[PDB]
């Protein structure tokens, strides 16, 4: 059985402050710009629609170098921090970005149609852009986020699938990894295996997988490490409503019509697809640069940083406003050309995290060794043994890596997530 | 007289946990996908209008198995479960689907002309979507759940029924089951037997029935068993104007307008529909993924599982999102055409329900055992007698079939609903 | 280690009324008007504008009191603290409209029907928009800090080809009146980024967009930059288009499948939104309301070294352009375009309303120690009186505010006073 | 020093409930009709314009009290106090809409394909609008004071030349009953500023829109002009269009790069957007509710000095205008365009519903010496009586309410009257 951590974590009075200096992000919104012949990523894919999922590193307790440690026996017992503030502080001007196809599958304009549509040709592709659906979030717990989307099933040697057959689905659980996209309007699924096109959505997701949080999963977690605490905030409404073109899949079922005649003789793709738009971003309903208090977890892991980690995941698209930058070929003539003028688009992004930890003590008894051990091995294995500290368990995949080793401060006071929280203990 | 079940059904300090595992469902939005010449469904339909109606099944508490049983006396008397706390776990991404026609029966743009629209000729039909009618309820009680629609009533055997005729009006009370239509913004109505056009609205409810629950009649009735909880949230407004062709059925009354003249002369259709939107979809207005505490029903039914049955019925439209999904017929030429993709429309509905039950006692008096048999003679029946296999009441109607036997938990502890449960009991 | 102002900073009990009357900007809503010269006739008034208010006050030491009993002129010192501010506004709620003859748009991309014709020799057009909403008031005894793209400098390497893409770098500076908001387009220097003088409207299209640092401010070890503030901002996408240019990074061909035909040259994708600051209105009002500055944040709570204060607003609420014209002949009585002079003007109408708290500093070692470490020229400012007071931000231009003349004791008498009384028995 | 009416002004425990029976407006939306005879046929009535309600008092020292007992006649008099209002409104909530046949209204220019053509002679279009939304409600027992922009005194220098620019000045101004309200395109003086004539709708085209001025009104020391206000006003951008006619201000070249061909000339970049107030709805009235008048925050609480009160009233939430057409003919059969005349009418109900509290004031020598500096008319008007007793105010014009006939001590027997004893006990 799984308890609390309430029951083998003594908790202590000594409280440090530990944030970030103040993190940047700048790039292109779209994709990672590089050279032609060259692999290596010369400017980056920053987007508003990207997860940040922060590793943080912090200090061991164990280790680390107090100005007094009589409130704890060395022989007996060890030290976990535990989170009870997180501020996660954002910096630039609240607004919405944009994200296109040039050559998006869309045929025509369903929403109204004054006669029936031509025939589509070869390529009717247009070049089209939307306003993503509006996310925020934050997950936190001591191990990374789990994702949740749809991509392509194993098939059935059986029924020999012939080239162009509808792909079978599959829910599929994955770890969230920094830059990561969220769903934007178009679901959670694998769009470079689920759509052989390359058109159907934007450039920015249309060779990459949207992830959802599997919020259902994580809280199920039995020990609870996964997320001790969440914040979501999602919107969308159907902008436009439009066709697909390309060739019917699976046909239209005829006792589900009349047959047509003349230019209705010909049914037009009933494929259809919406715009998705995420709608006004507003101050008031700002996720952010507000404090958060992990005081009574959910969860039996009640905000305790095992292993001295600590995962951070946000989603912030309430500031995705890309901005244009065109530098001129030549500074001579006084008459506009466009081709004297390259056109680029670039995004930035502006966190500061902020953290208030409570020191902690487990005194090691049988029963406690016991229960860590079946928990998690790597526990007892990484404190006083330690000899060695054991190479990074997910190197495979990547984060935004957050030192906070050298950032620990006992003066509360001189902070502001540090005041707010010693001002909430007023009580 | 019917009595509150708290006079005749006694409480006892057990509870229990159940949940199913993780329930999904893919399919196609609009139409199952069957193999021609056959009939079998290869491919379901699977939409975020459709309801979803889980009949529960739960272990019967005389024949489990419990480690003490001194807290009854089963002379005496017999166990039921009582339903105290429910939460539907839902899955996927917040998010709008789309539906619509091929030959959706719309003659001009009614909302803005600009001079007289032309003349209906032969099949005047539009490839046209649209964004249904957003709907969010969760129905709990120990029966199925009731629907009303219109359908077409029968006819007074007087004056014949010309062809043509407008067919006559019925309020049609039936029971919901698993996989019906709701409503979409073109009201409740069986569209099979009222629109023989096969056009009036999209294909997903052009030859299906829209039910609506009858909450007037459920809770109108008196034991209360059909449902002793709901929660309903429905909203919609007209995005589009639209006309309908076809020929005047009932002309316009000649009292009401002026007579035209050339363009004019002839009256358009009069015969207007409108095009539904359920709007923005929000995390803050979500009915789901949170508890409700079944304590105190509005009926005489307090969460009684007679039967050891529990019938749980949802629509959520606020998952719709429909994903298209292509897969090239060759992968040779880097030249788009459409002709190399079959296009193809999939959904996934995800869910997970978790219960908290209640055990109850029944003392077998006089008065006891008349009520019960009165109130539904199989109670008793299927109590200490038992006797043969006890045949399903309801083998017409179909559910989501949902079984609980396996997963009752004591140890309310390592669940979160549990969790919640417990501390909801610091009062 | 810092310390609130609570430690060393002695509370009196008298309290002082200071309001300006009514303060009034007119002037052309996107440029100045000017004459050969470069004299300003007419100037750049907006509501999408910050207002940075310079308020000077009456040095405590210096002024003139009924009663010098209730401190020790040789032990301490005196200084204002600020405990309630009221930043009267004064015009009808409402939203002007910002454009540029020649934007560079090219094509319309919410929707379209056919693949776009391809981009001739200029393809601006004239186009405008409403721009994003916002409030905020930011109060400190510094002035305001902020943040915005600018062009970095770029590293002794690789050459710099003309056109290529400049190098972004954050840039802090100092809020000045007459600075623009973030407007829809972020916070950054369109002069320097955006060689074009085509992507933005006429009145951000040679200026920089400022956004305040509200994580550097607040971060601050003292908290004398702001020790008050509140926001208001939205915005949501009117439209979606596409700039003219050409491509200064191709669209990696790993993302799309070659077209052909109509579809064989790839149509810009670089987009842009227009933005819109929706509706307006009373019951989202931030202004014509007392703010009782009691509790700061921060650890200068309020107090208002050298005498200085700064008042910092955004209020696009009120942004309402008003179109004049003027007939060329009263003549004809039928209406001809060049008979009519058309013009555009901006007002926006301030009143500014403060409660003082009269404030004393014992000049022990340690305060006096404290004090010069956190800014020398207070103590240097003080008895000495610092030898030609000489202004430390003559290279900032604020709106210079002049109380020195305008502190009454009887709150009584003046709307906030009365306020103050009231909220606080 | 002005003090608050609780000093000298006594309360007594008697009230007087006070109503209109109905009031009632119908007229001509856009402008008054008369014969070509400037007596008024039709009034100009529509929803965007104040109301301003002069309430007549019987003087409470000539009134027949059954009981005389609770003052004295030879040392004190009376004033109504106002205690409670309730301000009904009766048709039902709509929204009207204006326009001019002839709006200065170039392009569209929120999205253009294309380099718009050239402004040639009259390119004026048919053009409607909704307005902002506004509602408020002032009282005060002087009449209310707006302000508008207006044209400005020139400076003795330069001659104008035909078409400058008319210089600006903020106008004080008594709002009278008939005045418009802003509706979206500020508080002007469109005969004055605008010599098009078609810049802005009808109704407010040779109209001044002015607004109230709350900053001045509430600093005014005794407080009279308004004792109490609910403001509640709403707007978005409908649609952003540019003006025809001359630059009149050319756009500095340093903020653009010359174009060629069809953008070799700059499309006036005098743009104006269309007002839209949005939605109207029951939740957001701010009539038929009551309001105490309890605590003012000005020194007059509620006093009805002079006998007289001033209730100013804007409701846009029922401005909704029926179109109302005749036949010429009454016989035919076919429709024919000339056969019925179309006009238009608006209707606008009000019922003005108030408790009142009779007051003593003792005429002490500091007293008497107060009022007489504050208002002496006030003292002549007591004991003197044969004042001859004109008009100060005769100049302006309000829709005059008596209600000297129609004071009842029965609470119990009006709305307000069982509304205000629930809520006193």
């Known amino acids: 059985a799984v308890v609390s951590t309430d029951e083998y974590v003594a908790r202590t009075n000594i409280y440090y402050h530990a944030g970030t200096s103040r993190l940047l992000a700048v790039g292109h919104p779209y994709f990672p710009i590089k050279k032609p012949n060259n692999n290596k990523i010369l400017v980056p894919k920053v987007s508003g629609l990207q997860y940040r999922v922060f590793r943080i590193h912090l200090p061991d307790p164990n280790k680390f170098g107090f100005p007094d440690t009589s409130f704890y026996n060395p022989d007996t017992q060890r030290l976990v921090w535990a989170c009870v503030g997180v501020e996660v502080g954002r910096g630039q001007p609240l607004g919405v970005g944009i994200s296109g196809h040039?050559?998006?599958?869309?045929?025509?304009?369903?929403?109204?149609?004054?006669?029936?549509?031509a025939n589509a040709g070869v390529d009717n592709r247009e070049c089209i852009s939307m306003d993503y659906k509006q996310t925020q979030l934050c997950l936190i717990g001591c191990?990374?986020?789990?994702?949740?989307?749809?991509?392509?099933?194993?098939p059935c040697t059986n029924v020999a699938v012939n080239p162009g057959d509808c792909p079978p689905l599959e829910?599929?659980?994955?770890?969230?990894?920094?830059?990561?996209?969220?769903?934007?309007?178009?679901?959670?699924?694998?769009?470079?295996?689920?759509?052989?096109?390359?058109?159907?959505?934007?450039l920015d997701i249309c060779t990459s997988i949207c992830k959802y949080p599997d919020y259902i999963k994580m809280v199920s977690e039995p020990y609870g490490d996964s997320l001790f605490f969440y914040l979501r905030r999602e919107q969308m409404f159907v902008r436009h409503l439009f066709n697909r073109a390309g060739t019917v899949g699976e046909n239209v079922p005829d006792d589900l019509y009349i047959k047509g005649s003349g230019s209705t003789a010909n049914l037009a793709s009933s494929n259809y697809f919406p715009t998705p738009s995420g709608s006004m971003v507003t101050s008031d309903a700002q996720i952010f640069n507000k404090p958060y208090w992990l005081q009574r977890a959910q969860g039996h892991n009640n905000g305790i940083c095992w292993g001295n980690q600590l995962f951070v995941t946000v989603v912030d698209t309430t500031r995705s406003t890309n901005m244009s930058l065109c530098a001129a070929i030549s500074t001579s003539e006084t008459t506009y050309k466009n081709t004297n003028f390259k056109e680029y688009l670039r995004h930035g992004e502006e966190y500061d995290l902020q953290f208030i930890f409570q020191l902690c003590k487990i005194t090691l008894t049988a029963d406690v060794m016991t229960y860590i051990h079946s928990m998690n091995s790597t526990i007892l294995e990484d404190?006083?043994?330690?000899?060695?500290?054991?190479?990074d368990p997910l190197k495979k995949y990547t984060f935004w890596e957050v030192n906070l080793k050298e950032k620990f401060s006992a003066d509360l006071d001189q902070f502001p997530l540090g005041r707010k929280f010693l001002l909430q203990a007023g009580l």
């Open 102 to 117: 040039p050559l998006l599958n869309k045929l025509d304009d369903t929403e109204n149609a004054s006669a029936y549509a």
């Open 171 to 202: 829910l599929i659980n994955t770890v969230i990894q920094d830059g990561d996209m969220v769903d934007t309007g178009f679901g959670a699924m694998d769009f470079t295996t689920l759509q052989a096109n390359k058109s159907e959505v934007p």
């Open 143 to 154: 191990k990374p986020p789990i994702g949740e989307h749809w991509g392509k099933g194993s």
């Open 383 to 391: 404190w006083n043994g330690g000899g060695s500290g054991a190479e």
